[PDB]
Design an enzyme around this catalytic site. Structure first.
Site, mmCIF file in Angstrom:
data_model
loop_
_atom_site.group_PDB
_atom_site.id
_atom_site.type_symbol
_atom_site.label_atom_id
_atom_site.label_comp_id
_atom_site.label_asym_id
_atom_site.label_seq_id
_atom_site.Cartn_x
_atom_site.Cartn_y
_atom_site.Cartn_z
ATOM 1 N N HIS A 246 0.913 -1.142 0.148
ATOM 2 C CA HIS A 246 -0.112 0.078 -0.061
ATOM 3 C C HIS A 246 0.818 1.282 -0.026
ATOM 4 O O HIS A 246 0.334 2.321 -0.321
ATOM 5 C CB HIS A 246 -0.929 0.019 1.299
ATOM 6 C CG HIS A 246 -1.874 -1.013 1.138
ATOM 7 N ND1 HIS A 246 -2.946 -1.250 2.072
ATOM 8 C CD2 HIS A 246 -2.264 -1.710 0.103
ATOM 9 C CE1 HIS A 246 -3.764 -2.015 1.896
ATOM 10 N NE2 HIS A 246 -3.443 -2.678 0.622
ATOM 11 N N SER B 121 -1.070 -0.875 -6.403
ATOM 12 C CA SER B 121 -0.862 -1.907 -7.366
ATOM 13 C C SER B 121 -0.113 -1.605 -8.640
ATOM 14 O O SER B 121 -0.366 -0.448 -9.033
ATOM 15 C CB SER B 121 -2.019 -2.750 -7.510
ATOM 16 O OG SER B 121 -2.484 -3.276 -6.271
ATOM 17 N N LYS C 105 -15.325 -7.959 -7.675
ATOM 18 C CA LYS C 105 -14.487 -8.841 -8.467
ATOM 19 C C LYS C 105 -13.768 -9.742 -7.718
ATOM 20 O O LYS C 105 -13.506 -10.904 -8.218
ATOM 21 C CB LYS C 105 -13.256 -7.731 -9.046
ATOM 22 C CG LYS C 105 -12.601 -8.589 -10.218
ATOM 23 C CD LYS C 105 -12.027 -7.704 -11.258
ATOM 24 C CE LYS C 105 -11.375 -8.285 -12.411
ATOM 25 N NZ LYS C 105 -10.895 -7.349 -13.543
ATOM 26 N N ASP C 106 -13.292 -9.636 -6.370
ATOM 27 C CA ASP C 106 -12.594 -10.643 -5.942
ATOM 28 C C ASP C 106 -13.809 -11.572 -5.196
ATOM 29 O O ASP C 106 -13.515 -12.686 -4.865
ATOM 30 C CB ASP C 106 -12.111 -9.883 -4.515
ATOM 31 C CG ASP C 106 -10.803 -9.181 -4.967
ATOM 32 O OD1 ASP C 106 -10.223 -9.347 -6.170
ATOM 33 O OD2 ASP C 106 -10.237 -8.379 -4.010
ATOM 34 N N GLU D 246 3.634 -34.400 -3.930
ATOM 35 C CA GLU D 246 2.376 -33.540 -4.510
ATOM 36 C C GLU D 246 2.914 -32.831 -5.706
ATOM 37 O O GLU D 246 4.258 -32.778 -5.733
ATOM 38 C CB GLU D 246 1.962 -32.973 -3.454
ATOM 39 C CG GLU D 246 1.056 -33.595 -2.271
ATOM 40 C CD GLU D 246 -0.161 -34.128 -2.879
ATOM 41 O OE1 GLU D 246 -0.646 -34.025 -3.756
ATOM 42 O OE2 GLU D 246 -0.619 -35.339 -1.919
HETATM 43 C C1 HEM Z 1 0.447 -16.145 1.668
HETATM 44 C C2 HEM Z 1 1.292 -15.735 0.744
HETATM 45 C C3 HEM Z 1 0.762 -14.269 0.045
HETATM 46 C C4 HEM Z 1 -0.501 -13.652 0.113
HETATM 47 C C5 HEM Z 1 -1.716 -14.118 1.121
HETATM 48 C C6 HEM Z 1 -0.332 -12.646 -0.875
HETATM 49 C C7 HEM Z 1 -1.111 -11.511 -0.985
HETATM 50 C C8 HEM Z 1 -1.148 -10.599 -1.830
HETATM 51 C C9 HEM Z 1 -2.104 -9.496 -2.193
HETATM 52 C C10 HEM Z 1 -3.582 -9.695 -1.375
HETATM 53 C C11 HEM Z 1 -1.753 -8.664 -2.894
HETATM 54 C C12 HEM Z 1 -2.453 -7.454 -3.457
HETATM 55 C C13 HEM Z 1 -3.555 -7.933 -4.668
HETATM 56 C C14 HEM Z 1 -3.010 -8.833 -5.892
HETATM 57 O O1 HEM Z 1 -1.747 -8.054 -6.117
HETATM 58 O O2 HEM Z 1 -3.297 -9.524 -6.129
HETATM 59 C C15 HEM Z 1 -0.251 -9.118 -3.364
HETATM 60 C C16 HEM Z 1 0.511 -8.312 -4.090
HETATM 61 C C17 HEM Z 1 1.654 -8.728 -4.478
HETATM 62 N N1 HEM Z 1 2.313 -9.906 -3.935
HETATM 63 FE FE1 HEM Z 1 1.649 -11.270 -2.684
HETATM 64 N N2 HEM Z 1 1.133 -12.638 -1.442
HETATM 65 C C18 HEM Z 1 1.712 -13.830 -1.031
HETATM 66 C C19 HEM Z 1 2.843 -14.022 -1.347
HETATM 67 C C20 HEM Z 1 3.806 -13.708 -2.333
HETATM 68 C C21 HEM Z 1 4.695 -14.278 -3.156
HETATM 69 C C22 HEM Z 1 5.173 -15.616 -2.943
HETATM 70 C C23 HEM Z 1 5.132 -13.390 -4.100
HETATM 71 C C24 HEM Z 1 6.258 -13.350 -4.983
HETATM 72 C C25 HEM Z 1 7.276 -14.296 -4.814
HETATM 73 C C26 HEM Z 1 4.373 -11.946 -3.825
HETATM 74 C C27 HEM Z 1 4.636 -10.892 -4.718
HETATM 75 C C28 HEM Z 1 3.638 -9.976 -4.777
HETATM 76 C C29 HEM Z 1 3.802 -8.833 -5.613
HETATM 77 C C30 HEM Z 1 5.085 -8.310 -6.360
HETATM 78 C C31 HEM Z 1 2.527 -8.147 -5.393
HETATM 79 C C32 HEM Z 1 2.376 -6.644 -5.934
HETATM 80 C C33 HEM Z 1 1.636 -7.126 -7.530
HETATM 81 C C34 HEM Z 1 1.135 -5.786 -7.980
HETATM 82 O O3 HEM Z 1 0.798 -4.665 -7.548
HETATM 83 O O4 HEM Z 1 0.746 -6.026 -9.530
HETATM 84 N N3 HEM Z 1 3.413 -12.398 -2.832
HETATM 85 N N4 HEM Z 1 -0.010 -10.196 -2.565
HETATM 86 C C1 LIG Z 2 6.941 -35.120 4.270
HETATM 87 O O1 LIG Z 2 7.084 -35.230 2.709
HETATM 88 C C2 LIG Z 2 6.058 -34.301 2.052
HETATM 89 C C3 LIG Z 2 6.271 -34.585 0.724
HETATM 90 C C4 LIG Z 2 5.198 -33.812 -0.090
HETATM 91 O O2 LIG Z 2 5.109 -33.568 -1.379
HETATM 92 O O3 LIG Z 2 4.541 -32.952 0.666
HETATM 93 C C5 LIG Z 2 3.272 -32.066 0.160
HETATM 94 C C6 LIG Z 2 7.068 -35.471 -0.286
HETATM 95 C C7 LIG Z 2 6.623 -36.647 -0.548
HETATM 96 C C8 LIG Z 2 7.441 -37.424 -1.455
HETATM 97 C C9 LIG Z 2 8.712 -37.095 -1.612
HETATM 98 C C10 LIG Z 2 9.300 -35.794 -0.984
HETATM 99 C C11 LIG Z 2 8.177 -34.975 -0.495
HETATM 100 O O4 LIG Z 2 8.680 -33.774 -0.024
HETATM 101 C C12 LIG Z 2 9.185 -32.663 -0.857
HETATM 102 C C13 LIG Z 2 9.615 -31.594 -0.353
HETATM 103 C C14 LIG Z 2 10.130 -30.602 -1.288
HETATM 104 O O5 LIG Z 2 10.516 -29.512 -0.625
HETATM 105 C C15 LIG Z 2 10.960 -28.511 -1.326
HETATM 106 C C16 LIG Z 2 10.251 -27.474 -2.268
HETATM 107 C C17 LIG Z 2 10.737 -26.798 -3.076
HETATM 108 C C18 LIG Z 2 12.003 -26.239 -2.974
HETATM 109 C C19 LIG Z 2 12.828 -26.910 -2.182
HETATM 110 C C20 LIG Z 2 12.356 -28.079 -1.354
HETATM 111 C C21 LIG Z 2 13.204 -28.828 -0.587
HETATM 112 N N1 LIG Z 2 14.005 -29.332 0.217
HETATM 113 N N2 LIG Z 2 10.461 -30.888 -2.432
HETATM 114 C C22 LIG Z 2 10.125 -32.021 -2.878
HETATM 115 N N3 LIG Z 2 9.558 -32.842 -2.204
#
Ligand code: HEM
Ligand SMILES: CO/C=C(/C(=O)OC)c1ccccc1Oc1cc(Oc2ccccc2C#N)ncn1
Ligand SMILES: CCCCCCCCCCCCCCCCCC(=O)OC[C@H](COP(=O)([O-])OCC(O)COP(=O)([O-])OC[C@@H](COC(=O)CCCCCCCCCCCCCCCCC)OC(=O)CCCCCCCCCCCCCCCCC)OC(=O)CCCCCCCCCCCCCCCCC
Ligand SMILES: CCCCCCCCCCCCCCCCCC(=O)OC[C@H](COP(=O)([O-])OCC(O)COP(=O)([O-])OC[C@@H](COC(=O)CCCCCCCCCCCCCCCCC)OC(=O)CCCCCCCCCCCCCCCCC)OC(=O)CCCCCCCCCCCCCCCCC
Ligand SMILES: CCCCCCCCCCCCCCCCCC(=O)OC[C@H](COP(=O)(O)OCCN)OC(=O)CCCCCCCCCCCCC
Ligand SMILES: CCCCCCCCCCCCCC(=O)OC[C@H](COP(=O)([O-])OCC[N+](C)(C)C)OC(=O)CCCCCCCCCCCCC
Ligand code: HEC
Ligand code: HEM
Ligand code: HEM
Lengths: 67, 241, 49, 378, 61, 75, 54, 54
Positions: free
Chosen positions: D200, D204, D226-227, D270
């Protein structure tokens, strides 16, 4: 004593075009391995291909006769 | 690291998305487990009470529970004793532990069947194909005594002798007990054993589809309604010259 | 010069009851509002279930 | 004047969900922010209601889960919501991250790097959740992954035995994973609030990558509805898996109790971990596999440093669009290879796809942005 | 012709927000029974003769 | 945070807006919508299709080469 | 609340789950407890405003 | 572990076998009492000095 619908419709699948082709390839293997009794080749591959084509036909028709 | 044979897809009557189990076939399938399978295979997670209102009446299931003896106690002397089964008892285990089971089955361990349909790729298609799929070994394959050729089993050498055959049991409703019939009924029961919630989730699934088919276009219409202010807005640029 | 500013034509977007520029919009205000709110009411009835 | 604006509590909700100026042109790829918030809440509710009946002991961990699906009223619907909700969580996470790469949102450094931390803690959460039912894959998935830590030089075994509480995945490992699987989703939610705090500060991004301060709209009613619509599609996708195919994404081995002696034939994670499982097995060396496995996700923190384009979004960059979908298809290749045995030709394909992954992110995509600058004469 | 049904629905039920809510909570009561009754009738019809309530009469006494 | 009235500077731009209770929420939904979806796909199909086709080729070959590698030969 | 007819297995397990979730709900409410406090600052032993001496 | 068959003995397992489990448990049990000492001083401070006007 009883008429199992499996073995009766199995004979209907065996007399299909793709099934008999897999049988003679197995019978060719049954004749190949029995002739020279000095090897370790087995005819598992030629059997599963026959079962794969046969049981695909069995599943489509079997359940119409059972309860 | 052997060759594999995958099971075909049989047209089970519970295969469809909205299709319930056939509860008459469940009833017959329980009779197969009791009479044939229960002497080697446990079902540790199904109890007689689970049958009530699915494939037997409460009175029927009570009489069924009373046909076996189960251990209870201690009494006031500290001794264990035997009593007739009740609805709350789980199905008797055939062996006290897996070590006794292996000794009674030439070293092989019959698995618990409570979840067998869900614990094997192919489910009832696999189980149906295994029971009904025994045949002579191919030329050049000689299995040691104690093991049986079955092309659907991994490795093609299984330690279970063929357990079902024509007239292995008599059904209460007169159905001819052919091998394929017995396999089909026991597989349906085992599906229920592994997924008792089967029928109810499909009933829920139908209601979810119907509600979504209503709510999705109405909510879509609400979105478009509010956004129409923006989607039809017109812009004009009038800079001084 | 601001007297040159005419409002664009929204005929492609207007509802059928609002196409005639010589008919009062009050004659259809209750029906148009009722429809979009019936959509909202039915939506809430669905989520409530 | 206005109660919604001046009250200390409502002004935070007002300045976040109601009066927030948002761009007029953000597309469906911006819905995954709220959907991740819903999935996190959805996983906490079902997660809590499962903890009222689950026991974290080997003698009853497997059967307590069975007790839920059979005896507990609507326990089966609560479990499969939890298991499939985790998969929906990872669908949304990957759309959420991919949206950030394509459209340049990573230029928000603080928002993006906190996102990387959110990805890691959600992965660690699901990894520990899969151990709790104590099935075959629960045990052996835990064994093959935790054993990788022994490859760290000079502190490997001491670190692995400390995480285990013994000499292998055992009773002590199962109980603490439940405790850690409980504490982390709340730590995640707090970091998701800081994730919004830094967002914020700037507002965005939008599909064009051009500033939208000249054209903003309030978040309510336009993006509240929309959400809500997007959340309704999320429930459709979840409930289709729960009510028509609850065992599609899961492995049948997990319906067999744990067995330290008997190993399943094919140990596959998975679907949302297959791409990283493939990268692990494609590297022959053990310590090299761990570094590549950790670098497969930590590389995201380097994308802002590897941005060469004068333009922010890939919308106006065709040569970068092709490389972007080459990254998706290459990740769809690693996913496919991850669920297959380590045999010919999958070994070679998994190695090629692994090198192509790091080559696309480190070398090719930065080079495309520079070529694109020259074609536009800047 | 009198005003359309949607027009009389608005002025009579939807204008006030309080009656707009009373319409919804009353519409939710009858919708639940009518939808559950009808929806169950579709599930049982598609699965005729398979559910326990169909084979129930055979084991009365 | 950022507030309306403090965002940026704009001049000489007029905006006409219609109330949502006087316009259709689905104006020409299929008439203009379907031609616009074909345009939107045609303008991006050459950007997205090739890599997923390249995967589909590798997926098909590698699965064929996998099965034929374990099947026995006369040797 | 019992999950049955007395304090039993079902009562013991959910109390553990509730005993786990609540301290984090508590900590969040303790942050709102500080949000409203800093709007005014602290009282002092005299009950007189201390803005003249902070 | 939150099961009646082992809930009592799992606590025993901590104070006996777990490394410094006994110090962690009694910190938890007595920390709760210190929590309530502080809560009651905290509330009593608010009554005496009038802080409840917030
Ligand atoms: C529990 C995990 C996460 C939640 C609940 C979450 C939630 C949100 C929300 C609500 C927004 C604003 C609305 C939207 O842009 O859709 C946002 C924006 C953003 N998120 Fe996440 N996020 C998470 C994880 C991540 C991850 C893993 C990344 C990238 C590695 C990330 C990067 C960003 C970026 C760059 C924005 C800004 C996007 C824009 O303004 O266009 N977030 N996130
Ligand atoms: C406890 O094992 C859980 C598993 C799973 O898929 O959970 C959702 C699993 C099952 C069989 C074999 C391996 C398993 O766990 C995992 C865990 C795993 O963790 C990572 C994911 C992304 C990047 C790095 C790692 C690591 N370390 N990357 C691959 N397999
Ligand atoms: C269900 C699985 C969905 C798979 C992904 C589908 C991709 C997509 O376009 O989503 C529609 C939808 C369109 O939203 P948008 O904001 O208008 O445009 C987003 C992009 O800008 C889109 O960029 P674009 O402007 O270049 O448009 C690409 C084009 C892509 O369209 C296509 O390639 C398919 C064309 C269908 C032709 C009819 C054949 C039958 O999409 C459209 O123009 C509208 C498609 C409408 C669906 C009609 C289907 C019939 O986008 C999404 O929802 C993305 C998330 C979907 C993942 C769901 C998985 C869970
Ligand atoms: C995991 C869950 C992921 C959630 C994703 C979140 C999606 C989201 O919230 O964004 C909504 C966003 C809203 O789209 P929109 O309001 O129409 O605006 C699109 C632009 O204005 C573009 O306007 P346009 O002129 O290109 O409109 C083309 C037309 C699509 O063109 C068509 O009408 C195709 C019709 C195919 C049937 C052919 C029969 C002849 O409309 C659409 O693009 C919507 C596609 C959905 C069609 C639903 C079936 C009709 O996109 C959607 O995905 C709407 C799906 C709603 C489902 C309706 C089912 C009832
Ligand atoms: C690391 C985890 C690995 C796990 C592997 C998971 C398997 C992947 C399965 C593939 C599913 C693909 C999703 C559908 C893609 C639709 C793309 C599209 O519709 O066309 C291109 C679109 C063009 O839109 P513009 O904004 O450029 O211009 C619009 C003007 N009318 O451009 C866009 O809309 C693109 C926006 C970004 C979409 C993100 C999808 C990719 C997800 C994985 C990314 C992981 C990165 C590390
Ligand atoms: C303990 C027992 C208590 C039981 C109590 C039961 C009560 C049931 C609901 C009744 C309240 C209705 C209130 C109302 O009706 O006022 C809400 C608002 C009005 O609607 P309006 O703008 O037409 O103005 C209306 C203008 N008039 C009035 C002139 C026409 O309704 C809307 O706008 C919002 C509707 C959209 C629904 C979706 C929201 C749910 C969240 C997301 C779900 C999916 C993912 C989780
Ligand atoms: C002893 C006389 C048995 C009878 C009666 C039944 N089964 Fe059995 N079963 C038995 C053994 C010793 C084994 C172990 C085989 C091995 O090599 O490990 C089994 C195994 C099974 C399996 C598991 C197959 C697998 O994929 O691992 C199934 C699905 C199975 N058995 C089914 C089954 C059914 C349905 C029975 C009643 C009709 C039945 N078995 C009876 C020993 C014995
Ligand atoms: C980001 C949030 C979460 C994710 C991604 C997640 C993921 C998972 C997954 C994938 C499983 C495996 C389920 C299975 O295979 O059956 C699991 C198990 C479990 N989780 Fe979670 N979970 C989350 C939050 C929680 C929370 C907050 C709790 C407790 C309050 C919880 C309690 C449990 C329990 C008790 C199990 C074992 C029961 C079971 O296997 O179904 N989860 N989790
Ligand atoms: C987890 C429980 C609580 C925590 C952690 C907590 C913490 C705090 C802190 C840090 C302060 C500011 C410093 C101070 O005044 O000492 C404060 C002030 C205050 N608290 Fe609490 N508090 C809690 C519960 C309560 C309760 C139970 C009450 C009364 C019913 C209360 C009433 C007040 C009041 C009135 C003040 C302002 C005191 C003043 O300004 O003089 N709080 N609290």
């Amino acid at each position: 004593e009883l008429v199992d619908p499996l073995t009766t419709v199995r004979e209907q699948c065996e007399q299909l075009e793709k099934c008999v082709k897999a049988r003679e390839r197995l019978e060719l293997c049954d004749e190949r391995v029995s002739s020279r009794s000095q090897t370790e080749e087995d005819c598992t591959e030629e059997l599963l291909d026959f079962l794969h084509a046969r049981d695909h036909c069995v599943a489509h028709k079997l359940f119409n006769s059972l309860k | 690291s052997d060759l594999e044979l995958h099971p075909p897809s049989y047209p089970w009557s519970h295969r469809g998305l909205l299709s319930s189990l056939d509860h008459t076939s469940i009833r017959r399938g329980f009779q197969v487990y009791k009479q044939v399978c229960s002497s080697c295979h446990s079902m540790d997670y199904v109890a007689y009470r689970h049958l009530v209102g699915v494939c037997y009446t409460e009175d029927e299931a009570k009489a069924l529970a009373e046909e076996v003896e189960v251990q209870d106690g201690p009494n006031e002397d500290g001794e264990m004793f035997m009593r007739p089964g009740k609805l709350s008892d789980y199905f008797p285990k055939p062996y006290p532990n897996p070590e006794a089971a292996r000794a009674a089955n030439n070293g092989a361990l019959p698995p618990d069947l409570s979840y067998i349909v869900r614990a094997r790729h192919g489910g009832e298609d696999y189980v149906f194909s295994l029971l009904t799929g025994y045949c002579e070994p191919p030329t050049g394959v000689s299995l040691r005594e104690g093991l049986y050729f079955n092309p659907y089993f991994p490795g093609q050498a299984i330690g279970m002798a063929p357990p079902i055959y024509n007239e292995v049991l008599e059904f209460d409703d007169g159905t001819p007990a052919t091998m394929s019939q017995v396999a089909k009924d026991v597989c349906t029961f085992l599906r229920w054993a592994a997924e008792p919630e089967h029928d109810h989730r499909k009933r829920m699934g139908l209601k979810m589809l119907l509600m979504m088919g209503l709510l999705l276009p109405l909510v879509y219409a609400m979105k478009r309604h509010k956004w129409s202010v923006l989607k039809s807005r017109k812009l004009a640029y009038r800079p001084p010259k | 010069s601001h007297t040159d500013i005419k409002v664009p034509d929204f005929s492609d977007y207007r509802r059928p009851e609002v196409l005639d520029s010589t008919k009062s919009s009050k004659e259809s205000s209750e029906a148009r509002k009722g429809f979009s709110y019936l959509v909202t009411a039915t939506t809430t009835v669905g989520v409530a279930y | 004047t206005n109660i919604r604006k001046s009250h200390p509590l409502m002004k935070i909700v007002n300045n976040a969900f109601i009066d927030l100026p948002a761009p007029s042109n953000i597309s469906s790829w911006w819905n995954f922010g709220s959907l991740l918030g819903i999935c996190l809440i959805l996983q906490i509710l079902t997660g809590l209601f499962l903890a009222m009946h689950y026991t974290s002991d080997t003698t009853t961990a497997f059967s307590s889960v069975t007790h839920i699906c059979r005896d507990v009223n609507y326990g089966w619907i609560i479990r499969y919501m939890h298991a499939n909700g985790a998969s929906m969580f990872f669908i949304c996470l990957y759309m959420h991250v991919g949206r950030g790469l394509y459209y340049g949102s990573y230029t928000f450094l603080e928002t993006w790097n906190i996102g990387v931390i959110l990805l890691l803690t959600v992965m660690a959460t699901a990894f520990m959740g899969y151990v709790l039912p104590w099935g075959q894959m629960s045990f052996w998935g835990a064994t093959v992954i935790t054993n990788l830590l022994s490859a760290i030089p000079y502190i490997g075994t001491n670190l692995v035995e400390w995480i285990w509480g013994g000499f292998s995945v055992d009773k002590a490992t199962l109980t603490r994973f439940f405790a850690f699987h409980f504490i982390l989703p709340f730590i995640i939610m707090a970091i998701a609030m800081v994730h919004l705090l830094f967002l914020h500060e700037t507002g965005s991004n939008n599909p064009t990558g051009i500033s939208s301060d000249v054209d903003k709209i309030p978040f309510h009613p336009y993006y509240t509805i929309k959400d809500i619509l997007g959340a309704l599609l999320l429930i459709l996708a979840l409930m289709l898996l729960v009510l028509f195919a609850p065992d599609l994404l899961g492995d049948p081995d997990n319906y067999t109790p744990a067995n330290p002696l008997n190993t399943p034939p094919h140990i596959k994670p998975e679907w949302y971990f297959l791409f990283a499982y493939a990268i692990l097995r494609s590297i022959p060396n053990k310590l090299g596999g761990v570094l590549a496995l950790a670098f497969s996700i930590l590389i995201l923190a380097l994308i802002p440093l590897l941005h060469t384009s004068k333009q922010r979004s890939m919308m106006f960059r065709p040569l970068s669009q092709c490389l972007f979908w080459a990254l998706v298809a290459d990740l769809l290749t690693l996913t496919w290879i991850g669920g297959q045995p380590v045999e010919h030709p999958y070994i070679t394909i998994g190695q090629l796809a692994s090198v192509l992954y790091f080559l696309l992110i480190l070398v090719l995509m930065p080079t495309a942005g520079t070529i694109e600058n020259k074609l536009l004469k800047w | 012709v009198a005003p359309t049904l949607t027009a009389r629905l608005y002025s009579l039920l939807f204008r006030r927000t309080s009656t707009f809510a009373l319409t919804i909570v009353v519409g939710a009561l009858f919708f639940e029974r009518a939808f559950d009754q009808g929806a169950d009738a579709i599930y049982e019809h598609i699965n005729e003769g398979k559910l326990w309530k169909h084979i129930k009469h055979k084991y009365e006494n | 945070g950022r507030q309306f009235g403090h965002l940026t500077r704009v001049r000489h731009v007029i905006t006409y807006s219609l109330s949502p209770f006087e316009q259709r929420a689905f104006p020409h939904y299929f008439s203009k919508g379907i031609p616009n979806v074909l345009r939107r796909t045609r303008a991006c199909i050459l950007r997205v299709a090739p890599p997923f086709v390249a995967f589909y080729l590798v997926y098909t070959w590698g699965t064929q080469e996998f099965e034929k590698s374990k099947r026995k030969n006369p040797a």
